Design a protein around this ligand. Structure first.
Ligand SMILES: CCCCCCCCCCCCCCCCCC(=O)OC[C@H](COP(=O)([O-])OCC(O)COP(=O)([O-])OC[C@@H](COC(=O)CCCCCCCCCCCCCCCCC)OC(=O)CCCCCCCCCCCCCCCCC)OC(=O)CCCCCCCCCCCCCCCCC
Ligand SMILES: CCCCCCCCCCCCCCCCCC(=O)OC[C@H](COP(=O)(O)OCCN)OC(=O)CCCCCCCCCCCCCCCCC
Ligand SMILES: CCCCCCCCCCCCCCCCCC(=O)OC[C@H](COP(=O)(O)OCCN)OC(=O)CCCCCCCCCCCCCCCCC
Ligand SMILES: CCCCCCCCCCCCO[C@@H]1O[C@H](CO)[C@@H](O[C@H]2O[C@H](CO)[C@@H](O)[C@H](O)[C@H]2O)[C@H](O)[C@H]1O
Ligand SMILES: CCCCCCCCCCCCO[C@@H]1O[C@H](CO)[C@@H](O[C@H]2O[C@H](CO)[C@@H](O)[C@H](O)[C@H]2O)[C@H](O)[C@H]1O
Ligand SMILES: CCCCCCCCCCCCO[C@@H]1O[C@H](CO)[C@@H](O[C@H]2O[C@H](CO)[C@@H](O)[C@H](O)[C@H]2O)[C@H](O)[C@H]1O
Lengths: 459, 57
């Protein structure tokens, strides 16, 4: 991985040593060439995972996530380029640096071979992210969103640090391969029940699980565009990636300890989906859409079946590209009228016919139209959840109906009806804004033709 | 015939000859407890380095 990491560490000197008129071109050119090199990880001709050293190693779970991270860096640079044009030079280079730093840590976070190394990297991402939301956010509420984001994570993460230390003080190591090949069944004593929650609540908060999710709609609604893109596409998947990795050493307590969290996800996802029907803020509607998709990911990981893992991995990558595409699209309006209210601007298909096509395709991905990989996830999670118990189809049936309503209601409200003709500042879509959407959508279409690449570990 | 000792002669440290045996354990002390055995060998580098969490060297 040191050939994906070291060149990425060089985008930091390149950011600072480049000319004022070359920073945005140079960095965004080399970010693409770094996401090309990360494709080497996909050269997996065998059933043995790639182990590069004692530190890093790539699996079929950590490779899609690694690549999605590297590909997202150039996307976020282009997204952040028009709302930073009024800042002096050092602020732009300081913004570019915080985004690169978040790509370097995220790649190391998914490639780490030891839990303690995962934890530290998994905590370091708060710094660049807290700086982004707070320094470059727009409203006065960005200060309260940084606190909610920082201390939901930290409160959950202290018990995880405790539990990880107990694992090593007993097993001798935190290496993920060794803990896999030497795992011993846990007793059902009241101490291991707490060890289970200690190892899980950190990741269940980051998903977020229903109940403890109020940090996400606060963070999204106030972060700059690249703050929402990375949050909705990668940082939520730190929770999912962690739970998959550490749940191997927690058996058999997941057969009963998971009930409270399968129930909060299955019921919680209906509560969040139905919120999107009455949400007056467009950036808020998407953020609750994320909460209700991650609910299925939580539910499917808690049952540990080959299908459920397979559906969750596909839904992790699919949601990564889709939610990011939605946030970019909502930003495109926001960078014209500087209002997040969904009903303020209407009939935008009349003056942005092409941007209205991307809206439709993003919206169709969100409501999981076959054959997109958004459905494959939803469909394979449903299949596994049905086998787990047959009445989960009742709640997933409902959530599928609501998911259609708020997806199309989102499209019908903003793109149709009459134009809000007083908006004389609706400039034609930039070539930059359209490229940003094509870069989200083309990979999503390509991954549908080759789903094998995002089946995860079980398949 | 008695001669008075000069100044300083009575305070001298003299040697006395006697056939009394020399005591060997005048304090009636027990045996001193054994020292902790020393560890023999030459230093070798620590196996696999510091062995500190995930650090390799
Ligand atoms: C990329 C390189 C290709 C060049 C693209 C291009 O030049 O387009 C110019 C072409 C004409 O130029 P335009 O006048 O500016 O059109 C834009 C208008 O504003 C309005 O554009 P539009 O609305 O007329 O066309 C967009 C079209 C969406 O794009 C399409 O043209 C439909 C093509 C299928 C996708 O909208 C839809 O009809 C949605 C279709 C939903 C499909 C439902 C069925 C899905 C299941 C079947 C597929 C799976 C089959 C598996 C087999 C088993 O416009 C477009 O095709 C849209 C450009 C974006 C590409 C859309 C995605 C295709 C890629
Ligand atoms: C025309 C599209 C095409 O080329 O299809 C061919 C190939 C699918 O063929 P294949 O799946 O290998 O066959 C297996 C048995 N049928 O299709 C493919 O293999 C194309 C796969 C596209 C791979 C993505 C390319 C990189 C794009 C940047 C990644 C950004 C998304 C991040 C997620 C990465 C997850 C891998
Ligand atoms: C700026 C934005 C980016 C932020 C990056 C955040 C970095 C966080 C680093 C956390 C610590 C991980 C690295 C420490 C480590 O374990 O490296 C051990 C390294 C071993 O040597 P190495 O050649 O790398 O591999 C083994 C062969 N000797 O030997 C070392 O100890 C090298 C220590 C220096 C690490 C550079
Ligand atoms: C783990 C990832 C690494 C994290 C690294 C932490 C980076 C530092 C974060 C704290 C923010 C630094 O604080 C930042 O300071 C710079 C200059 O120093 C200020 O920069 C701005 O103001 C000052 C004067 O007011 C000018 O000199 C400067 O040119 C201008 O752009 C920013 O307004 C401020 O936000
Ligand atoms: C199960 C594990 C999950 C545990 C999660 C616990 C997370 C803890 C988060 C700490 C939140 C601190 O919250 C802190 O106080 C309140 C919370 O309303 C916010 O304050 C906000 O509401 C209060 C009302 O009480 C107003 O007075 C204030 O003007 C407004 O900004 C502060 O801006 C924030 O800094
Ligand atoms: C709100 C935060 C929640 C904190 C969560 C922290 C995680 C919970 C950890 C499990 C509870 C403690 O787990 C504890 O492990 C220790 C050793 O490690 C063992 O406890 C015992 O250890 C050894 C034997 O092993 C005995 O000599 C000792 O007297 C006793 O403490 C038991 O296994 C359990 O009592």
């Amino acid at each position: 991985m040191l050939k994906i990491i070291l060149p990425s560490l060089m985008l930091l000197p390149l950011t600072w040593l480049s000319s004022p008129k070359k920073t945005w071109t140079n960095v965004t050119s080399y970010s693409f060439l770094i996401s090309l090199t990360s494709l080497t990880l996909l050269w997996q001709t065998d059933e043995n995972y790639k182990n590069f050293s004692n530190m890093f190693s790539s699996d079929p779970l950590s490779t899609p996530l690694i690549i999605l991270t590297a590909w997202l860096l150039p996307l976020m640079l282009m997204a952040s380029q028009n709302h930073l044009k009024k800042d002096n030079n050092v602020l732009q280079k300081l913004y570019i640096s915080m985004l690169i730093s978040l790509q370097i840590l995220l790649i190391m976070t998914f490639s780490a071979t030891e839990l303690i190394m995962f934890y530290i990297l998994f905590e370091a991402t708060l710094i660049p992210t807290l700086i982004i939301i707070t320094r470059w956010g727009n409203q006065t509420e960005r200060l309260n969103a940084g606190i909610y984001f920082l201390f939901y994570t930290l409160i959950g993460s202290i018990p995880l640090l405790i539990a990880l230390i107990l694992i090593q003080n007993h097993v001798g190591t935190l290496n993920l391969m060794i803990l896999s090949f030497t795992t011993h069944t846990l007793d059902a004593s009241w101490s291991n029940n707490l060890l289970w929650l200690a190892c899980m609540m950190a990741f269940l908060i980051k998903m977020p699980l229903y109940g403890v999710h109020l940090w996400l709609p606060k963070a999204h609604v106030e972060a700059p565009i690249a703050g929402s893109m990375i949050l909705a596409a990668i940082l939520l998947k730190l929770g999912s990636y962690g739970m998959i990795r550490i749940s191997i050493i927690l058996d058999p307590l997941t057969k009963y300890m998971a009930y409270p969290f399968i129930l909060l996800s299955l019921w919680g996802m209906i509560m969040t989906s139905s919120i999107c029907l009455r949400q007056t803020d467009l950036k808020s509607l998407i953020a609750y859409s994320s909460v209700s998709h991650m609910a299925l990911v939580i539910a499917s990981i808690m049952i540990q079946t080959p299908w459920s893992f397979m559906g969750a991995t596909m839904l992790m990558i699919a949601h990564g590209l889709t939610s990011s595409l939605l946030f970019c699209l909502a930003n495109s309006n926001y960078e014209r009228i500087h209002s997040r209210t969904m009903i303020m601007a209407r009939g935008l298909q009349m003056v942005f016919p092409l941007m209205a096509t991307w809206w439709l395709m993003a919206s169709l991905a969100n409501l999981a139209l076959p054959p997109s990989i958004n459905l494959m996830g939803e469909l394979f999670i449903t299949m596994s959840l049905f086998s787990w118990s047959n009445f989960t189809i009742i709640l997933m049936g409902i959530n599928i109906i609501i998911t259609g309503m708020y997806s199309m209601y989102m499209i019908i409200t903003t793109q149709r009806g009459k134009l809000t003709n007083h908006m004389i500042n609706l400039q034609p879509s930039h070539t930059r804004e359209l490229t940003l959407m094509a870069l989200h959508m083309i990979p999503l279409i390509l991954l549908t033709t080759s789903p094998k690449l995002i089946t995860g570990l079980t398949m | 015939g008695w001669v008075r000792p000069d100044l300083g002669q009575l305070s001298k440290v003299t040697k006395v000859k006697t056939d009394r045996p020399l005591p060997e354990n005048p304090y009636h002390s027990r045996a001193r407890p054994e020292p902790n055995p020393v560890i023999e060998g030459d230093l070798k580098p620590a196996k696999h380095g510091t062995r500190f969490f995930f650090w390799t060297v």
